[PDB]
């Protein structure tokens, strides 16, 4: 039980992430409302076996968000500043618009590209070997939405849900090459992910509490599924099961579509502290880690729901075909 | 459990060897201290010069006085006591 | 040099001097 | 492969001591050899050669504590891992 | 300076009861103990057992050195960090 | 408390040589001599003397007397793990993988 | 010939299993192998 309260008693967890280079390493970001404390902005690092408090941190009075790590291995750290700028730090070392999203594009030959979606929608991208990083390199793409999801197999293509109620798609060759919109349910979508399995399946979730299986091969979505709290964070589970999860108000609603229908498979309120914030599952153990709106951290383990091990694994492509069948049924 | 392997003394002096060895085992954990215990004990009770080696993988060739020699195993320690001078 | 080498030793010393047995 | 570790005696007797421990190795050079027979040989040879009250000891891990006459003590090591002590008393 | 930083962080580490920073000798530079003679017998004889420990860990072969000696007992926790010049021991609660 | 559990114990993965030895210093069963018989003899004798020294210290001036050794498990990382578990008559040792 | 000796030997099974578990838990120490990343 590692319930971290380093300072963050008056902070609010904005993001939680894990490290592939160190599978036992996790980095969290929070935003503070009380300035009468240690410092401003947040990036905290710690391992699973290390002391509850964050082992390593970065100290400054700079509010920092849009955090991501070097793609090959944890050697460089990138952050998208609140004023549209971008900063990069050597890990092996001691604008009228904010940036919304950030991503590394791994080019193994050299440094790895940087893409930042701003709060207006427009996308920027660049990379430079000198990391003291100079934003002089830059490219701009005419982008309308805020959270841009990229195509796992073909990283140049991307999509987004816009406030106008559509879901735009395009790619890196031209920002205007392919400017149609996904219209599965045609709602103001603010979240997108991709099924981390065989297909080119992605998901997009709207302000109207609607979740949408964008199969890249289709213009009409597969399973127009539907549930309160779909504005907020969604995720594909790091299991063979295509498990879905939404989480607000110290409450998580969980879907295991691999064993049951689109009704919620589990739901859990948490009394540790109110208003759960960002979460993290690791593939290794079901020690699920979560933050709270009070800035604290916690974790629990429910191993019986780990895996079903027969239907999730090779029947999952059949399950996606079955979802397309459910579309033919909708028709 | 003393195990005499080659002794020269009379049965009484041998019994004294094993008794002093048992006492040294009861009191001192280090072989040097055990050997000094035994050597000083015999040099004091008798008179002259005794020498005691305590080991586990050990061979030697020494001269010694007549009926003044023992090579034995007390527990699992090799005790070689003798008198020269 | 001795202070810095002792420092390098003491770094990992503290590192796995915090990690104790847990459930 | 003689590796002398601690010397106290004269270099001639050094050389003869090395030769004698070598000859003992050849007298007992087989997996059935015992260090005790070579020890007998070393001590008896150094007796009949340089006088009595010699003492030969062979092993690799042990702890001795002995009294020795000056210029009559040697301890040494072998690439074959044979630590050999000899001394007169 | 790093000796200062590490002593400081050990002090910050709650559940510690008696700190014990010695040199390679039996000299307690600083100790959070109620009585010093107790720490004296330890900071003297424990280096003896540490010499025995380095002896045996090399008796295996010169492949590793004694990096730590961290023991946990029912009552407390004796952390020992062998250091080039120093040795960083602390009596903690075994939490 | 039987040969069945003992075989299970041998089946414990990661362990290389088990050495149970009576406090007299007699390795009764083993799985280290199964690789080299000259290892467990040296180890048993040396570690029995070590445990005697440990008794001295567990009875010297800070550790209250009448407190006995319970378990002395040591580990030389990248070399091996070596648990010592004292008994009234026995001593369970194991050389596992660290 | 003493079979009760072997039974007393088997009696060590509980402590030996607990110690096997403790060894599995304390298998590997913390590794912080030296590495250098572009050192610029």
UniProtKB/TrEMBL annotation, chain B:
GO BP of this protein: microtubule-based process; mRNA transport; protein transport
Record GO terms (molecular function): dynein intermediate chain binding
Principal location listed in the UniProt entry: cytoplasm
Pfam family of the protein (one): Dynein_light
Keywords for this protein: Cytoplasm, Cytoskeleton, Dynein, Microtubule, Motor protein, mRNA transport, Nucleus, Protein transport, Transport
SMART domains: Dynein_light
Domain of life: Eukaryota
A single cellular component GO annotation: cytoplasmic dynein complex
Keyword hit for Isomerase: no
Family from the record: Belongs to the dynein light chain family.
PANTHER family associated with the record: DYNEIN LIGHT CHAIN
The protein's name: Dynein light chain
Biological source species: Tetrahymena thermophila
From TrEMBL, chain D:
GO cellular component terms listed in the entry, alphabetical order: axoneme; cytoplasmic dynein complex; microtubule
GO BP annotation list: microtubule-based process
Transmembrane segments: none
Primary residence: cytoplasm
Keywords: Cell projection, Cilium, Cytoplasm, Cytoskeleton, Dynein, Microtubule, Motor protein
Subcellular location: Cytoplasm, Cytoskeleton, Cilium axoneme
Organism domain of life: Eukaryota
GO MF annotations, alphabetized: dynein intermediate chain binding
Assigned protein family: Belongs to the dynein light chain family.
Oligomer status and interactors: Consists of at least two heavy chains and a number of intermediate and light chains.
Function recorded in the entry: Force generating protein of respiratory cilia. Produces force towards the minus ends of microtubules. Dynein has ATPase activity.
Protein name, per record: Dynein light chain
Organism: Tetrahymena thermophila
């Amino acid at each position: 039980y590692y319930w971290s309260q380093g300072d963050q008693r008056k902070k609010n967890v904005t993001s939680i992430c894990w490290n592939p280079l160190y599978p036992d390493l996790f980095a969290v970001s929070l935003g503070s409302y009380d300035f009468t404390k240690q410092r401003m902005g947040l990036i905290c690092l710690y391992s699973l076996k290390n002391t509850t408090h964050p082992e390593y941190a970065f100290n400054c009075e700079a509010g920092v968000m849009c955090l991501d790590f070097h793609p090959k291995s944890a050697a460089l750290l990138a952050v998208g500043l609140y004023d549209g700028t971008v900063l990069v730090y050597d890990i092996r070392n001691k604008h009228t618009d904010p940036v919304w999203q950030v991503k590394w594009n791994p080019d193994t030959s050299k440094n790895y590209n940087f893409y930042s979606i701003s709060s207006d929608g427009r996308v920027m991208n660049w990379i430079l070997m000198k990391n003291k990083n100079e934003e002089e390199s830059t490219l701009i793409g005419l982008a309308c939405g805020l959270c841009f999801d990229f195509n796992k197999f073909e990283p140049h293509i991307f999509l987004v849900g816009t406030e106008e109620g559509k879901i735009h798609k395009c790619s890196r060759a031209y920002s205007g090459q392919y400017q149609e919109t996904y219209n599965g349910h045609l709602l103001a979508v603010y979240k997108v992910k991709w099924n981390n399995f065989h297909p080119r399946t992605f998901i997009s979730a709207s302000a109207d509490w609607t979740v949408r299986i964008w199969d890249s091969k289709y213009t009409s979505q597969i399973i127009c599924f539907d549930l309160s709290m779909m504005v907020v964070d969604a995720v594909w589970a790091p299991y063979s099961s295509t498990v879905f999860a939404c989480a607000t108000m110290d409450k998580v609603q969980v879907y295991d579509l691999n064993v049951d229908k689109l009704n919620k498979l589990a739901e859990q309120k948490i009394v540790k502290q109110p208003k759960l914030t960002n979460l993290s599952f690791n593939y290794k153990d079901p020690i699920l880690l979560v933050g709270d709106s009070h800035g604290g951290v916690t974790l629990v383990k429910l191993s019986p729901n780990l895996c079903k091990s027969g239907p999730e694994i090779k029947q999952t492509e059949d399950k996606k075909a079955m979802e397309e069948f459910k579309n033919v049924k909708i028709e | 459990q003393p195990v005499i392997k080659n002794s020269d003394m009379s049965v009484e002096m041998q019994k004294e060897v094993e008794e002093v060895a048992k006492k040294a085992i009861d009191y001192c954990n280090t072989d040097k201290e055990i050997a000094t215990f035994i050597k000083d004990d015999f040099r004091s009770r008798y008179h002259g010069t005794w020498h005691c080696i305590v080991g586990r993988n050990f061979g030697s060739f020494v001269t010694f006085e007549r009926s003044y020699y023992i090579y034995l195993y007390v527990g699992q320690l090799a005790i070689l006591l003798f008198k020269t001078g | 040099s001795m202070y810095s080498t002792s420092f390098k030793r003491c770094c990992k010393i503290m590192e796995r001097m915090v990690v104790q047995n847990d459930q | 492969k003689a590796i002398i570790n601690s010397s106290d005696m004269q270099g001639d007797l050094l050389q003869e001591a090395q030769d004698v421990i070598q000859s003992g190795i050849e007298n007992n050079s087989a997996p059935v050899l015992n260090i005790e027979a070579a020890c007998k040989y070393i001590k008896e040879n150094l007796d009949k050669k340089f006088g009595p009250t010699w003492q030969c000891i062979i092993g690799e891990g042990y702890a001795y504590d002995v009294t020795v006459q000056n210029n009559t003590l040697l301890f040494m090591f072998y690439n074959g891992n044979l630590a050999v002590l000899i001394f007169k008393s | 300076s790093e000796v200062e930083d590490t002593l400081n962080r050990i002090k910050t580490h709650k559940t510690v009861l008696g700190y014990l920073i010695v040199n390679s000798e039996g000299g307690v530079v600083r100790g959070a103990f109620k009585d010093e003679e107790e720490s004296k017998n330890i900071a003297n004889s424990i280096p003896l057992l540490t010499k025995k420990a380095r002896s045996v860990v090399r008796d295996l072969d010169p492949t590793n050195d004694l990096v730590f000696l961290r023991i946990q007992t029912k009552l407390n926790e004796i952390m020992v960090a062998p250091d080039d010049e120093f040795s960083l021991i602390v009596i903690q609660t075994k939490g | 408390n039987a040969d069945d559990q003992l075989k299970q114990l041998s089946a414990l993965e990661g362990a290389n040589g088990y050495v149970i030895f009576n406090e007299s210093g007699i390795p009764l069963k083993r799985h280290e001599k199964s690789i080299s018989h000259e290892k467990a003899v040296h180890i048993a004798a040396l570690v029995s003397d070590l445990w005697n020294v440990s008794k001295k210290v567990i009875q010297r001036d800070l550790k209250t007397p009448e407190n006995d050794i319970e378990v002395i498990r040591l580990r030389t990382k990248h070399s091996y793990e070596y648990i010592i578990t004292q008994s009234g008559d026995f001593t369970m040792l194991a050389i596992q993988l660290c | 010939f003493p079979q009760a000796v072997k039974d007393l030997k088997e009696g060590v099974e509980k402590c030996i299993y607990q110690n096997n578990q403790i060894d599995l838990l304390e298998e590997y120490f913390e590794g912080e192998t030296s590495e250098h990343v572009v050192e610029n």
